[PDB]
């Protein structure tokens, strides 16, 4: 039974299932939230002891209280598995811990639940018992996780642990108060004392087992490698799926355990060149072996396939399709109507401007308004192609308002196919709107018979009516739904909201004709024709019935906002997937009639990308109302081994439950694993996550089952990771002339400590990031030059904007997608100075390792420095590359060798080109993020390449003058003569480019961090790496070649030859006056005992130390 298991746990305690279901079910819908909060305070959910039963009962009430329908209920199941609401809950707790507790003056008892009213806290429902003044920051501030119910003078906030029924009476009272209309009610959470500090188990990530031995090519103990028959493997693998008759199940089993059955392909006449003719699909559309996903016609991408991203996309697109299915269309017709070529041509440098609203929606809610307004219907003799539903909003008290209505009336006289509606929107509460509307609703029949303007003004004063209260109520709802101010003039044809109107001179009779003409060309005609092509021109029978379709389709052109995503607003509905014949390469799963969601996947089985897509897709199909047509299109061109890994996705469509009812954790277990093959563990985690290994026995970088069978006795690999941080990342800009405010330094703070974190603004589109967990934070400019020239106006937490209400320098993260920011900073008047120009411990060494040999020699590196130094040395490392076995042991090194150590990390920016091999990633962390990795307090760092023996006091290098250089290096030895043929750096390319500069070595170096930032070296390293990374062959060693190619622009200080020694280019005599030896590559265990005699001495010191701790 050879298996490997990987599980992921969050950096916070599990909030009870009770509160999670409340927040997940009432996703955001506050009306659902309080109707369920009432039922949990009633006592209906008290019998739910086993968390599964609690979930079970929530299904009953959601469906029974009308809150959820089966189609959207399946989405509830999947989102609940994902535990989407847990970080939202932890935000309340962190806020309670950092802002609420300190302000709460006095000792709490019986105050498990308490209200906050006017700076006073009350622990009793009676309101007569006030425990204390709520000092410090006022907690009545509007925060994202809040939920406002009712309007009131008093602002009531209930901090509750809902697990105890003691909350129930407090709620009922506040609920009564809010429903009466005396106060605005909002619910915040208190860390429930019934639940334990058991970390939360997360899902929605992927695991990879990379066979690092990929040099092979010309149940199963080793990876079988074939000759030049690779070419067809993708093709026969695809046929193997069709032959199976459990197709997407085969696709998964084959794609996830690819190496296993790799050579077994091309056997038992699976040659099946049936889909060879199926390239009729290829012959007209997209290339062989290309990965393309679509959702209702829209363009889906590789990393829009994180479970979190998909859940919000289903939710938004079901709402869009359901808006269309109120118009009598099927899921397939609705999508084909939306994803039609006539529609795509209406859309497609940089340019955009517009505002539109739903016609179906607005005429349903505002019934007593829209069926009681003066309606001049379009004469039934007008053609389908002429129909339009003009709706005019106007203040009939002012001349400009009544002038626009007159111009609309004259326009209706000329255009037969227009249904004209007039809604009175006054700005004075004394004149009830219902009376002026009913004044002209009497003259509705006699409307448009107005020759002079005075005829309308006189008709407004004739008659006397009663203020129809029902009318006024539906009017207020309309203006709120449509975001229309009182007394403002608006013109809305077919849903396209246009206005407000400044003066009625802007909009005359002739201007209305043109508005119909332009709207007709864009949203009316392409609908009629796309509609007539699909044989659905029967559904459009009336000016109003037509407008509902044209209006919905235009709204399908608005994408995200983008929150969490960077894809601002494109996605053009395509339709060419339909030309492809679905005989061989395609298979479908789900009913095409009841499906609201249409996933059209085009995956190549020989691709590594296909592995993830398939794994997610199975889970996505398990939602009642999701259709999936999977196209398999392989390529004939496979020069190397197509897939170089094993892959599993941790995700479930239905919530997992323990035997005791609690939530069951989701794990990635790989079965029938070869015992002879070398493996590496990698994580396929969503963009906002920072993940490092927690507890593991087996070296995550160097693995083989047969070896741990010979060490532990079992073939069961088990490891744990931690989602340690969630990113707060953003793109900075300058106000008003949008530029890159590079060199700007930032501080993240909380009401707990104001020096939480610090980073600097990057040159590539203003990138910055912070490693944080759910909670309320603030962002201030770092103490100094950043605050001098710049003042941060806002952190764009709501969108690019500016958005009214986003000028808050406050950030709060409450999602597994983090919080994407678009801050805006304006310069202080009359200045134009950049930070670049002005108006800790003795030694600071940093290192990294990625193997137990490198880790054993890293223990030696630390020990060698301390033996030869009488100074305060501090070690800095990259958290995630080290094994947990090494991480468990470093505090014991710190105590025995007398050093301190702080552990840094940074997540590779999404824009920056990543490296697939673990090795190439290692190299990038040494050179690319030096400026941002360390806090702004650290003056200088020194890198020592882990497998090293230092014999000199390293303080000398600290105070070595660099002379205008941000970093200093040790050069290549030209001492050994016999290896001159190997000295490539003094030849052709490296000789012409390096005119006289020496080839420096990326093994030992000094970084004067304050000069590094001052010079902005990192940004130049990063952007140069960018275009060079197109060919990985140019970056032979990106840690070494990058500073060497950049010594022409970024200065390189040269360090003495005594500092660096190698057993290939420096003579043995140099070792006498040695400072550091890299133990040069081209194994190390032999070279260490041979070159350095004291290497054994250090190894043995460590060996005893671990056993000393052991007892
Ligand atoms: C945010 O959340 C709220 C709350 O869920 C939603 O508001 C809902 O708005 C509508 C209009 O007021 C309510 O509609 C309800 O329709 C029920 C009938 O539905 C059936 O229709 C077909 C018939 O063929 C069936 O096939 C189908 O299965 C449906 O079941 C009525 O029975 C409802 O009456 C009463 O229901 C509940 C009791 O169960 C009461 O709490 C209500 O007050 C109501 O008197 C009702 O007419 C819907 O119920 C509203 N909810 C509430 C609680 O008021 C929002 O739409 C939602 N928004 C989003 C974006 O999710
Ligand atoms: C993708 C594909 O092969 N489609 C073919 C099409 O080209 C052909 O015209 C039609 C009738 O023979 O059958 C089908
Ligand atoms: C089975 O494979 C052989 C070799 O490719 C082929 O000649 C034969 O025709 C195949 N069988 C059938 C029934 O086509
Ligand atoms: C460290 O300090 C001791 C005591 O002052 C001194 O004897 C020793 O020489 C120092 N170490 C080195 C390497 O000089
Ligand atoms: Ca080394």
Residue numbers in the entry: 28 to 245, 279 to 408, 662 to 1152, 1197 to 1439, 1445 to 1473
Which lines from the publication concern this structure?
To assay the contributions of individual UGGT TRXL domains to UGGT reglucosylating activity, we cloned three mutants of CtUGGT, each lacking one of the TRXL1-3 domains: CtUGGT-ΔTRXL1, lacking residues 42–224; CtUGGT-ΔTRXL2, lacking residues 417–650; and CtUGGT-ΔTRXL3, lacking residues 666–870. CtUGGT-ΔTRXL2 and CtUGGT-ΔTRXL3 expressed and were purified. CtUGGT-ΔTRXL2 also yielded crystals, enabling crystal structure determination by X-ray diffraction to 5.7-Å resolution. CtUGGT-ΔTRXL2 and CtUGGT-ΔTRXL3 reglucosylation activity assays against urea-misfolded bovine thyroglobulin detect impaired reglucosylation activity upon deletion of TRXL3 and complete loss of activity upon deletion of TRXL2. In contrast, CtUGGT-ΔTRXL2 is completely inactive against urea-misfolded bovine thyroglobulin. The total loss of activity of the CtUGGT-ΔTRXL2 construct in the reglucosylation of urea-misfolded bovine thyroglobulin also points to a critical role for the TRXL2 domain. The CtUGGT crystal and cryo-EM structures (Roversi et al., 2017), and our MD simulations, all highlight the TRXL2 domain as the most mobile in the molecule, supporting this hypothesis. In the light of these data, it is possible that TRXL2 motions adjust the size or vary the surface area of UGGT's central saddle, making the bending motion a crucial one for activity against this substrate. Our observation that the face of the TRXL2 domain overlooking the central saddle bears distinct patches of hydrophobic residues conserved across UGGT1 sequences (Roversi et al., 2017) supports a model of hydrophobic-mediated misfold recognition. Our data support a “one-size-fits-all adjustable spanner” UGGT substrate recognition model, with an essential role for the UGGT TRXL2 domain.
Central to ERQC is the ER-resident 170-kDa enzyme UDP-glucose:glycoprotein glucosyltransferase (UGGT). The enzyme selectively reglucosylates a misfolded glycoprotein on one of its N-glycans and promotes its association with the ER lectins calnexin and calreticulin, thus mediating its ER retention. The full-length Chaetomium thermophilum UGGT (CtUGGT) crystal structures revealed four DsbA-like domains (TRXL1–4) arranged in a long arc, terminating in two β sandwiches (βS1 and βS2) tightly clasping the glucosyltransferase family 24 (GT24) domain (Roversi et al., 2017). Overall, UGGT's motions can be described in simple terms as two rigid groups of domains moving with respect to one another.
